[PDB]
Design an enzyme around this catalytic site. Structure first.
Site, PDB file in Angstrom:
ATOM      1  N   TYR A   1      73.982  59.040  31.405  1.00 50.82           N
ATOM      2  CA  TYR A   1      74.955  59.907  32.057  1.00 50.82           C
ATOM      3  C   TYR A   1      75.485  60.920  31.026  1.00 50.82           C
ATOM      4  O   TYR A   1      75.551  60.653  29.840  1.00 50.82           O
ATOM      5  CB  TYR A   1      76.052  59.080  32.738  1.00 50.82           C
TER       6      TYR A   1
ATOM      7  N   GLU B   1      71.122  67.883  17.154  1.00 52.65           N
ATOM      8  CA  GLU B   1      69.801  67.316  17.170  1.00 52.65           C
ATOM      9  C   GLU B   1      69.703  66.335  15.994  1.00 52.65           C
ATOM     10  O   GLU B   1      69.021  65.333  16.094  1.00 52.65           O
ATOM     11  CB  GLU B   1      68.736  68.416  17.091  1.00 52.65           C
TER      12      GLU B   1
ATOM     13  N   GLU C   1      70.549  64.964  30.851  1.00 52.42           N
ATOM     14  CA  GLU C   1      71.161  63.940  31.683  1.00 52.42           C
ATOM     15  C   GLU C   1      72.020  64.635  32.726  1.00 52.42           C
ATOM     16  O   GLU C   1      71.948  64.307  33.893  1.00 52.42           O
ATOM     17  CB  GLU C   1      71.955  62.909  30.863  1.00 52.42           C
TER      18      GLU C   1
ATOM     19  N   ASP D   1      62.036  74.182  16.835  1.00 56.77           N
ATOM     20  CA  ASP D   1      62.610  73.820  15.604  1.00 56.77           C
ATOM     21  C   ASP D   1      61.791  74.566  14.520  1.00 56.77           C
ATOM     22  O   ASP D   1      61.155  75.635  14.842  1.00 56.77           O
ATOM     23  CB  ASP D   1      62.645  72.293  15.438  1.00 56.77           C
TER      24      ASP D   1
ATOM     25  N   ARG E   1      53.912  75.327  15.058  1.00 60.22           N
ATOM     26  CA  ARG E   1      54.472  75.873  13.833  1.00 60.22           C
ATOM     27  C   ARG E   1      53.360  76.073  12.818  1.00 60.22           C
ATOM     28  O   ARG E   1      52.233  75.641  13.055  1.00 60.22           O
ATOM     29  CB  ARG E   1      55.522  74.910  13.249  1.00 60.22           C
TER      30      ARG E   1
ATOM     31  N   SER F   1      40.273  42.380  32.226  1.00 60.14           N
ATOM     32  CA  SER F   1      39.377  43.481  32.588  1.00 60.14           C
ATOM     33  C   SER F   1      40.099  44.828  32.524  1.00 60.14           C
ATOM     34  O   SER F   1      41.210  45.000  33.076  1.00 60.14           O
ATOM     35  CB  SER F   1      38.802  43.331  33.978  1.00 60.14           C
TER      36      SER F   1
ATOM     37  N   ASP G   1      52.945  73.779  42.743  1.00 61.87           N
ATOM     38  CA  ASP G   1      53.758  72.534  42.792  1.00 61.87           C
ATOM     39  C   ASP G   1      52.904  71.341  42.428  1.00 61.87           C
ATOM     40  O   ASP G   1      53.340  70.547  41.693  1.00 61.87           O
ATOM     41  CB  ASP G   1      54.418  72.308  44.171  1.00 61.87           C
TER      42      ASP G   1
ATOM     43  N   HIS H   1      57.184  57.895  30.599  1.00 59.94           N
ATOM     44  CA  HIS H   1      55.828  58.406  30.716  1.00 59.94           C
ATOM     45  C   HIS H   1      54.838  57.262  30.411  1.00 59.94           C
ATOM     46  O   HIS H   1      54.934  56.639  29.335  1.00 59.94           O
ATOM     47  CB  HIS H   1      55.608  59.525  29.683  1.00 59.94           C
TER      48      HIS H   1
ATOM     49  N   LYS I   1      58.746  56.611  15.285  1.00 58.06           N
ATOM     50  CA  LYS I   1      59.203  57.516  16.326  1.00 58.06           C
ATOM     51  C   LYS I   1      58.518  58.876  16.246  1.00 58.06           C
ATOM     52  O   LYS I   1      58.385  59.594  17.244  1.00 58.06           O
ATOM     53  CB  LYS I   1      60.705  57.674  16.109  1.00 58.06           C
TER      54      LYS I   1
HETATM   55  C1  LIG Z   1      55.733  65.689   8.881  1.00 60.22           C
HETATM   56  N1  LIG Z   1      56.892  64.912   9.338  1.00 60.22           N
HETATM   57  C2  LIG Z   1      57.732  65.540  10.200  1.00 60.22           C
HETATM   58  O1  LIG Z   1      57.490  66.621  10.708  1.00 60.22           O
HETATM   59  C3  LIG Z   1      58.934  64.793  10.709  1.00 60.22           C
HETATM   60  C4  LIG Z   1      59.734  65.534  11.789  1.00 60.22           C
HETATM   61  C5  LIG Z   1      60.928  66.279  11.154  1.00 60.22           C
HETATM   62  C6  LIG Z   1      61.719  67.177  12.168  1.00 60.22           C
HETATM   63  N2  LIG Z   1      62.542  66.325  12.964  1.00 60.22           N
HETATM   64  C7  LIG Z   1      63.707  65.899  12.519  1.00 60.22           C
HETATM   65  O2  LIG Z   1      64.155  66.030  11.341  1.00 60.22           O
HETATM   66  N3  LIG Z   1      64.427  65.247  13.410  1.00 60.22           N
HETATM   67  C8  LIG Z   1      65.593  64.486  13.027  1.00 60.22           C
HETATM   68  C9  LIG Z   1      66.240  63.735  14.217  1.00 60.22           C
HETATM   69  C10 LIG Z   1      65.203  62.851  14.873  1.00 60.22           C
HETATM   70  C11 LIG Z   1      65.774  61.879  15.933  1.00 60.22           C
HETATM   71  O3  LIG Z   1      66.921  61.343  15.801  1.00 60.22           O
HETATM   72  O4  LIG Z   1      64.929  61.511  16.800  1.00 60.22           O
HETATM   73  C12 LIG Z   1      65.120  63.487  11.983  1.00 60.22           C
HETATM   74  O5  LIG Z   1      63.901  63.117  12.017  1.00 60.22           O
HETATM   75  O6  LIG Z   1      66.001  62.954  11.229  1.00 60.22           O
HETATM   76  C13 LIG Z   1      60.736  67.978  13.038  1.00 60.22           C
HETATM   77  O7  LIG Z   1      60.392  67.446  14.133  1.00 60.22           O
HETATM   78  O8  LIG Z   1      60.325  69.044  12.559  1.00 60.22           O
HETATM   79  C14 LIG Z   1      57.160  63.700   8.784  1.00 60.22           C
HETATM   80  C15 LIG Z   1      56.490  62.537   9.161  1.00 60.22           C
HETATM   81  C16 LIG Z   1      56.820  61.333   8.566  1.00 60.22           C
HETATM   82  C17 LIG Z   1      57.818  61.331   7.589  1.00 60.22           C
HETATM   83  F1  LIG Z   1      58.146  60.290   7.052  1.00 60.22           F
HETATM   84  N4  LIG Z   1      58.462  62.436   7.214  1.00 60.22           N
HETATM   85  C18 LIG Z   1      58.136  63.626   7.808  1.00 60.22           C
HETATM   86 CA   LIG Z   2      74.709  60.279  27.680  1.00 59.74          CA
HETATM   87 CL   LIG Z   3      59.171  72.346  16.877  1.00 65.18          CL
HETATM   88 ZN   LIG Z   4      65.311  70.113  13.082  1.00 62.85          ZN
HETATM   89 ZN   LIG Z   5      66.024  67.855  10.832  1.00 65.94          ZN
END
Ligand SMILES: CN(C(=O)CCC[C@H](NC(=O)N[C@@H](CCC(=O)O)C(=O)O)C(=O)O)c1ccc(F)nc1
Ligand SMILES: [Ca+2]
Ligand SMILES: [Cl-]
Ligand SMILES: [Zn+2]
Ligand SMILES: [Zn+2]
Ligand SMILES: *[C@@H]1O[C@H](CO)[C@@H](O[C@@H]2O[C@H](CO)[C@@H](O[C@@H]3O[C@H](CO[C@H]4O[C@H](CO)[C@@H](O)[C@H](O)[C@@H]4O)[C@@H](O)[C@H](O[C@H]4O[C@H](CO)[C@@H](O)[C@H](O)[C@@H]4O)[C@@H]3O)[C@H](O)[C@H]2NC(C)=O)[C@H](O)[C@H]1NC(C)=O
Ligand SMILES: *[C@@H]1O[C@H](CO)[C@@H](O[C@@H]2O[C@H](CO)[C@@H](O[C@@H]3O[C@H](CO[C@H]4O[C@H](CO)[C@@H](O)[C@H](O)[C@@H]4O)[C@@H](O)[C@H](O[C@H]4O[C@H](CO)[C@@H](O)[C@H](O)[C@@H]4O)[C@@H]3O)[C@H](O)[C@H]2NC(C)=O)[C@H](O)[C@H]1NC(C)=O
Ligand SMILES: *[C@@H]1O[C@H](CO)[C@@H](O[C@@H]2O[C@H](CO)[C@@H](O[C@@H]3O[C@H](CO)[C@@H](O)[C@H](O)[C@@H]3O)[C@H](O)[C@H]2NC(C)=O)[C@H](O)[C@H]1NC(C)=O
Ligand SMILES: *[C@@H]1O[C@H](CO)[C@@H](O[C@@H]2O[C@H](CO)[C@@H](O[C@@H]3O[C@H](CO)[C@@H](O)[C@H](O)[C@@H]3O)[C@H](O)[C@H]2NC(C)=O)[C@H](O)[C@H]1NC(C)=O
Ligand SMILES: CN(C(=O)CCC[C@H](NC(=O)N[C@@H](CCC(=O)O)C(=O)O)C(=O)O)c1ccc(F)nc1
Ligand SMILES: *[C@@H]1O[C@H](CO)[C@@H](O[C@@H]2O[C@H](CO)[C@@H](O)[C@H](O)[C@H]2NC(C)=O)[C@H](O)[C@H]1NC(C)=O
Ligand SMILES: *[C@@H]1O[C@H](CO)[C@@H](O[C@@H]2O[C@H](CO)[C@@H](O)[C@H](O)[C@H]2NC(C)=O)[C@H](O)[C@H]1NC(C)=O
Ligand SMILES: *[C@@H]1O[C@H](CO)[C@@H](O[C@@H]2O[C@H](CO)[C@@H](O)[C@H](O)[C@H]2NC(C)=O)[C@H](O)[C@H]1NC(C)=O
Ligand SMILES: *[C@@H]1O[C@H](CO)[C@@H](O[C@@H]2O[C@H](CO)[C@@H](O)[C@H](O)[C@H]2NC(C)=O)[C@H](O)[C@H]1NC(C)=O
Ligand SMILES: *[C@@H]1O[C@H](CO)[C@@H](O[C@@H]2O[C@H](CO)[C@@H](O)[C@H](O)[C@H]2NC(C)=O)[C@H](O)[C@H]1NC(C)=O
Ligand SMILES: *[C@@H]1O[C@H](CO)[C@@H](O[C@@H]2O[C@H](CO)[C@@H](O)[C@H](O)[C@H]2NC(C)=O)[C@H](O)[C@H]1NC(C)=O
Ligand SMILES: *[C@@H]1O[C@H](CO)[C@@H](O[C@@H]2O[C@H](CO)[C@@H](O)[C@H](O)[C@H]2NC(C)=O)[C@H](O)[C@H]1NC(C)=O
Ligand SMILES: *[C@@H]1O[C@H](CO)[C@@H](O[C@@H]2O[C@H](CO)[C@@H](O)[C@H](O)[C@H]2NC(C)=O)[C@H](O)[C@H]1NC(C)=O
Ligand SMILES: *[C@@H]1O[C@H](CO)[C@@H](O)[C@H](O)[C@H]1NC(C)=O
Ligand SMILES: *[C@@H]1O[C@H](CO)[C@@H](O)[C@H](O)[C@H]1NC(C)=O
Ligand SMILES: [Ca+2]
Ligand SMILES: [Cl-]
Ligand SMILES: [Zn+2]
Ligand SMILES: [Zn+2]
EC number: 3.4.17.21
Lengths: 695, 695
Positions: B218, B370, B382, B399, B482, B574, B611, B634, B644
């Protein structure tokens, strides 16, 4: 011309009669060969009636049947273990049907097996308030007792759940003449009353929308993975069996212990209606013993799905659906509805053969295994949920067309209120003394709205029929209509011969609707609603009617809460957000309505407002569902937790408030009230916002 | 003319440069006044750029901040309790920024408070397999130990969860030069490497898509009812803190106990990388003590939502979204993306002022918080989930525009594969040695597909960015693009200065993209994709590309299972139903494609197939979600349970198979495999069926 009038005039009372006769000469129990042969006959006939395609959709689901060679019965046993009284093994078959085979004897579908022995406690209708009175006021403990309850007031499944939670070790259900014998009317075959040997069949599940007990969420298709029986949804844990009032008299007449607490606990038999536990002095060492040997079995079921493809919006679906499976002959339930569906299909098909097609697609369904927990409609909707949620305009149910001959009964979403009012103003009243007047006039006269003079009563949808999956799980606008009795002059429950062998063609033709004129009127109402939904350029829904009921429901839930003013102060329990959301919904719905009235052969604006109309019901769905009931997802409407047949409004709040004064941790309980208030307020505002300008 | 070329040519490298400089002079931490003032500046500028409406949508969410007057640090303490070594209280600020206030010191957002004291165990990257090696092979018990792990390979939140489940009482994260120092490159400010005092900030939640920890499901609006902190989603239960490699050297150099088990456990510091527990003989009585005093606080956040209303299908939404909040200056993360979004808005706005409008509505978003768990995008979705699920065509994330300067990186749904291929063939390569060649040629050359010669690599979406709610919860087709590094020649993790104070405008302008040509190319790719999604008459999705990957994923999950041939025989496991569903999907998608190519100015057929295209992503959503992860809905794609950031295909089956040979009740575990196979097979068939003829 090919308009609604051509459709309605093609409907014939005499065709409905013929179809009813055809559908009720043998039993059509879910999962039996005879119901499969009737499905194949329906499929063939709908094809010859002109539908574009007619298919069987089959599923393999848990059903329940008595053991043919090891009959269910109940006894009084003495000290020594002699069975000195035994309930009936079968209902005395009606005149002319005494050589029909395959009449299933009376039983409670999905009872576990058992032979429990014990003392009787009488629990009235086994409602929540009945158990409150027993336990809290009269200080009677049902733990380890067999409870005997009269049918009526609430779904039998809720009775069994209540008995279970009170610690009963078995349940005997019976039909009291107070609830199933109308004074001055004779017993079948000479009248429409239940005789003393008559017995109401029915399932005792608590499925809460799940469908097939073994496959919640997913269709019971050929490769489905099934829960084991111990993890099945909704099965009762104590044996249960139904009896007639001749048998019930013999079990009740020796009851001792406490007197009934007041006259609301006494039915009409010549017995004291003592609550028990156990029998009076001379017979105190006698007991009741149940013998239940029914088995649960995975069994194939068949829905018939017919399609009348739309000429303009073939990806928009209006569904007319009702079940085909019956407990025995099904003269009222369901074949008085299915006969009506069959004539509706025939009429739409004659227009189709002259070159007409509806604007939107119409789907017709003959559901199976409704009597075993809405299983056919549910599994089909689980299978096709993605199609239905993105394309389903509306669902019109078509079970029993009559339960009386007094006036019309409609239960539906507020979105169809104006549709129903307008359609009934164009139909002729079939009622004596209203010759040449509209169905709206007669209905309004005999069943006035409690809120507004000059309008008729339209009720909330509850549950206990095949619209449940479409409305409460998927958020498709749904409705139902039938002819009903005067509930004022008569204090009995539904119709007396409900789910009995005595529900026959002759019952209908002799005592309910000899000219089939009530049937024909219900066909015009159901058929008419489907026609208008499938053919009107703008969907015939009025969002402003939802605004009005939402205010009514908000006022009502607020008044329940305000029985607890101190707690509302202490815990800062405010309904402000819910009233604000409702006011916003009203304002936005009013502005939407003006745009709808005032928007030019622009099909995209039209479609975008038909999509706003169609998705408005959908907007009240919460994907997290209600607490511990994941398949009841509508936030405004759910089946009552105390009675599946009754609708409850703002069910999340209602249940958080229910009996709140008996909870041990009041901060926690009032916290959950506040949580539910937030959920409802958010969802109403979110629904309102689907009707703002889109960008 | 007003076509894609006019849009693309209006984009300017020099505008992106100016916007980046503007967005990175001060810190914009979520929930601080400075990030609110930047939101108001973005809102004003998007309005002056020409959007029809630009609003702030604010929410009140749980954030986390260090205590300004009670700093977090780690010590080595002796026998007596003297702190003989203390980690840094702040990163040495870069040149010219040494007087900037409000630089948040390094911390692990959402750490609980604590002062745990104990012996160190070194756990490598703290991956699932690292803990397996420690516990099962080396027989080392982490219970009651402080674990020290190097950043890299997986999301830090998964490291903390793994440490927790192993019974650690705290976690120290550090940046090893092996993973954050590229050989031959200098330390900031003379190069793009992480210096020894540099530290990676970041949240350590395990939210699994929930959004704000206190309001799962929510929006965190003004009247929201909040869980208490003890029932909050995703918070870690042991203190956690990040350090640089100068500090880490001091904590690791005295480690005793067992040797590292192999060279994959040794980074690049001059230390043995002993696993522990505890220090070698002379120092065995010394311990490590953490001092964590960060507090969790409900704090207001602000998203900027701009709307460019569609001329023809205003009720269809293409969304370009990226975050604005940064850990410190955000020179790469996120402002190199937000600068690009700002120029895209400016370009679309110049077309709009000359009279053009896109066919569909375009929504632009500047998300907040974020970095604290995707909170802004999640709460907004939400709030608006009903609108998004019935009207959302696609979501394009924005990003960081660069993490390297070697070639393009795209992760996206298979539905956008042809779109990306076609768009990149029309764009100019910015790469040295590919003057006058297409971006497709250069990208394909430097990043070949592993499956098909002559095509480039496009990866699955994982998570850890704002598309999570739109794709994995709501089923809207999503993608991201990117510029990236050569992952072949360089074995370091993302970019070295990730989430450090040293991520500045100068970092970008001096060492990544001095001419802003890589930025401009990413703007053309993101902008181009949005243009095509919002303007092509037929949605630019190719359902046949999903058929191909589904077969690949089915083959892959089958091969994992077939590591266990005896169990597959014993339990009758299977994959036939899943392969059958995939074959059906292929067949139906092929027939759909022919109808799409071959269907006449008939707008309803067009819309009904747009659609079908738009709802195809939606069809892979299961409303019951994955096991114990209700917001990952999904069935084809989820974030890996072990990381993650990484996508996993058929996640329900994958997780049921993972480590299955170590489960105590194999019948039960293989039963859950079969269950998940059924769920996937059903969902793929159901998705296929949304593409059959509608009636
Ligand atoms: C290459 N790489 C990355 O691009 C990580 C994603 C970083 C960046 N995302 C990002 O910083 N998100 C925040 C918040 C993520 C969340 O809370 O789900 C974080 O991860 O702390 C992005 O999506 O560009 C990477 C993979 C593994 C690792 F250990 N470090 C970097
Ligand atoms: Ca919420
Ligand atoms: Cl991105
Ligand atoms: Zn970011
Ligand atoms: Zn970040
Ligand atoms: C029924 O419909 C009405 C709209 O007609 C909704 O009204 C909104 O009411 C909310 C409260 O739930 C208002 O929230 C307040 O917003 C203020 C800022 O709003 C202005 O600026 C924003 C930019 O962020 C714009 O979106 C907006 O148009 C306004 O220009 C906040 O400052 C308020 O917070 C402050 O006061 C509160 C309360 O005393 C404190 O708790 C805070 O800590 C803070 O001090 C507040 O958040 C919102 O502005 C209203 N929108 C309007 C009038 O357009 C109803 O909410 C709706 N009903 C439901 C149930 O949804
Ligand atoms: C990929 O797409 C194909 C269609 O091209 C699907 O094929 C269906 O496969 C199912 C099996 O999962 C078939 O199921 C079988 O149906 C038989 C009856 O089908 C006929 O009659 C029905 C009316 O009910 C019509 O709908 C249908 O068109 C046929 O005319 C049953 O008799 C079968 O049951 C018997 O055999 C089985 C297996 O040995 C036993 O377990 C039963 O107890 C019983 O003896 C069976 O249920 C279905 O007919 C197929 N449809 C076709 C060919 O049109 C695939 O299922 C699909 N893949 C997935 C994963 O969905
Ligand atoms: C049920 O029947 C009633 C009465 O026929 C329907 O309401 C009426 O609907 C029509 C068509 O929208 C309205 O006509 C409008 O008139 C005004 C001029 O005053 C103008 O705004 C429009 O150009 C249009 O011609 C009529 O006002 C309205 N009457 C009411 C509300 O009393 C109702 O729509 C029907 N419900 C259905 C079909 O669900
Ligand atoms: C990416 O670009 C490719 C190549 O331009 C696109 O595929 C092509 O799309 C067009 C339009 O549908 C196809 O044209 C068709 O030709 C045949 C005659 O052989 C006829 O069936 C139709 O009348 C139509 O004119 C063309 O065949 C097709 N080429 C292929 C598949 O190689 C593709 O659609 C683009 N993808 C997008 C926009 O997502
Ligand atoms: C008046 N009334 C009814 O109409 C009950 C609904 C009966 C009928 N439904 C029905 O028989 N459904 C079956 C299956 C219901 C289910 O499993 O949800 C049943 O209830 O056993 C119908 O919807 O017409 C009623 C109310 C309370 C009561 F105790 N008995 C009858
Ligand atoms: C119910 O009506 C149907 C259809 O008229 C009857 O079924 C037909 O029976 C005739 C005579 O046996 C056959 O030649 C046809 O093949 C049947 N048509 C079908 C099934 O489409 C049916 O027998 C009637 N039932 C009763 C009880 O009278
Ligand atoms: C229905 O009841 C009968 C008979 O009382 C059951 O048949 C007996 O089952 C037991 C246990 O399997 C056997 O040992 C006997 O030899 C059977 N007796 C007869 C008369 O056949 C029958 O199994 C029950 N049917 C069910 C449970 O579906
Ligand atoms: C009630 O039914 C039971 C079961 O059929 C009857 O008791 C059985 O009677 C036969 C013949 O006398 C005995 O050999 C069996 O051993 C008895 N079985 C059980 C389970 O008791 C009983 O007579 C019937 N009672 C009445 C009043 O008709
Ligand atoms: C069908 O309609 C008639 C007309 O009202 C019903 O019969 C009457 O019922 C009333 C109301 O209780 C009595 O006052 C009359 O004595 C009855 N009159 C006749 C002519 O029988 C009849 O009961 C209805 N059928 C059903 C099943 O409800
Ligand atoms: C970033 O750019 C903006 C917009 O040009 C600058 O904000 C403007 O500052 C001028 C001069 O103070 C004001 O008169 C305007 O009101 C501002 N416009 C807005 C906020 O829309 C901003 O100061 C620049 N930031 C930096 C760090 O250079
Ligand atoms: C941040 O840390 C400071 C100082 O070390 C905390 O302030 C103290 O709080 C305790 C407990 O409430 C008081 O008894 C002291 O009198 C306070 N000391 C000072 C120097 O003011 C402060 O509460 C912490 N901030 C938080 C938890 O947000
Ligand atoms: C590490 O930091 C701590 C805390 O600031 C230092 O220990 C404190 O030193 C002061 C002044 O000598 C004492 O009066 C405090 O009682 C100490 N506090 C604690 C918690 O021990 C320590 O000196 C620092 N260590 C190094 C090597 O710099
Ligand atoms: C920007 O691009 C250049 C060109 O490749 C990168 O610099 C080279 O890196 C390679 C690969 O490791 C080395 O062989 C060369 O010594 C470097 N040459 C020059 C001219 O510096 C540069 O590293 C890229 N920027 C970033 C941040 O990756
Ligand atoms: C009811 O009966 C049993 C004793 O046979 C007992 O365990 C249960 O708690 C009793 N409840 C009462 C007396 O409230
Ligand atoms: C790890 O440590 C504690 C003892 O301090 C114990 O409870 C736990 O079970 C141990 N696990 C092992 C030795 O596997
Ligand atoms: Ca099911
Ligand atoms: Cl009905
Ligand atoms: Zn029925
Ligand atoms: Zn029934």
């Amino acid at each position: 011309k090919h308009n609604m009038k051509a459709f309605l005039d093609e409907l014939k009372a005499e065709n409905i009669k013929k179809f009813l006769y055809n559908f009720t000469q043998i039993p059509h129990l879910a999962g039996t060969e005879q119901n499969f042969q009737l499905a194949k006959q329906i499929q063939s006939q709908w094809k010859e009636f002109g539908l574009d395609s007619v298919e069987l959709a089959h599923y393999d689901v848990l059903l329940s049947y008595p053991n043919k060679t090891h009959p269910n019965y109940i006894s009084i046993i003495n000290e020594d273990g002699n069975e000195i009284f035994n309930t009936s093994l079968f209902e005395p078959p009606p005149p002319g049907y005494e050589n029909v085979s395959d009449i299933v004897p009376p039983f409670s579908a999905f009872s576990p097996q058992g032979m429990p022995e014990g003392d009787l406690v009488y629990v009235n209708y086994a409602r929540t308030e009945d158990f409150f009175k027993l336990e809290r006021d009269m200080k009677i403990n049902c733990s380890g007792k067999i409870v005997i309850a009269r049918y009526g007031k609430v779904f039998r499944g809720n009775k069994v759940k209540n008995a279970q939670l009170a610690g009963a070790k078995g349940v005997i259900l019976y039909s009291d003449p107070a609830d199933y014998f109308a004074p001055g009317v004779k017993s079948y075959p000479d009248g429409w009353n239940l005789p003393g040997g008559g017995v109401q069949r029915g399932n005792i599940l608590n499925l809460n929308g799940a469908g097939d007990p073994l496959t919640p969420g997913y269709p019971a298709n050929e490769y489905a993975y099934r829960r084991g029986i111990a993890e099945a949804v909704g099965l009762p844990s104590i044996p249960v069996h139904p009896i007639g009032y001749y048998d019930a008299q013999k079990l009740l007449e020796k009851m001792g212990g406490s007197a009934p607490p007041d006259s609301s606990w006494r039915g009409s038999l010549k017995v004291p209606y003592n609550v028990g536990p156990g029998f009076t002095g001379n017979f105190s060492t006698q007991k009741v013993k149940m013998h239940i040997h029914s088995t649960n079995e995975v069994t194939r079921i068949y829905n018939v799905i017919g399609t009348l493809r739309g000429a303009v919006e073939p990806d928009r679906y209006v569904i007319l659906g009702g079940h085909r499976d019956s407990w025995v002959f099904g003269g009222i339930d369901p074949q008085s509805g299915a006969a009506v569906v069959h004539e509706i299909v025939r009429s739409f098909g004659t227009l189709k053969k002259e070159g007409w097609r509806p604007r939107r697609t119409i789907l017709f369904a003959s559901w199976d295994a409704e009597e075993f927990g809405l299983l056919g409609s549910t599994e089909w909707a689980e299978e096709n949920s993605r199609l239905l949620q993105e394309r389903g305009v509306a669902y019109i149910n078509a079970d029993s067309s009559i339960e009386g001959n007094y006036t019309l009964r409609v239960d539906c979403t507020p979105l169809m209120y104006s549709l129903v009012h307008n359609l009934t103003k164009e139909l002729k009243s079939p009622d004596e003394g209203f010759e040449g007047k509209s169905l709206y006039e007669s209905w309004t006269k005999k069943s006035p709205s409690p809120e507004f003079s000059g309008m008729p009563r339209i009720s909330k949808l509850g549950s206990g029929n095949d619209f449940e999956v479409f409305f409460q799980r998927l958020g498709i606008a749904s409705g139902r209509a039938r002819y009903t009795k005067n509930w004022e002059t008569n204090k009995f429950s539904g119709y007396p011969l409900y789910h009995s062998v005595y529900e026959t063609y002759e019952l209908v033709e002799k005592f309910y609707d000899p000219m089939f004129k009530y049937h024909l009127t219900v066909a015009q109402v159901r058929g008419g609603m489907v026609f208008e939904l499938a053919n009107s350029i703008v969907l015939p829904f009025d969002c402003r009617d939802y605004a009005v009921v939402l205010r009514k429901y908000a006022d009502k839930i607020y008044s329940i809460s305000m029985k607890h003013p101190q707690e509302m102060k202490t815990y800062s329990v405010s309904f402000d957000s819910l009233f604000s959301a409702v006011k916003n919904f009203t304002e936005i719905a009013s502005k939407f309505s003006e745009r709808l009235q005032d928007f030019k052969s622009n099909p995209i604006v039209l479609r975008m407002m038909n999509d706003q109309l169609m998705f408005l019901e959908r907007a009240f769905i919460d994907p997290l569902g209600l607490p511990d009931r994941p398949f009841y997802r509508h936030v405004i409407y759910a089946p009552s937790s105390h009675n599946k047949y009754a609708g409850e409004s703002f069910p999340g709040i209602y249940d958080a408030l229910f009996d709140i004064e008996s909870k041990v941790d009041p901060s926690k309980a009032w916290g959950e009230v506040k949580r539910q208030i937030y959920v409802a307020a958010f969802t109403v505002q979110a629904a309102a916002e689907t009707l703002s300008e889109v960008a």
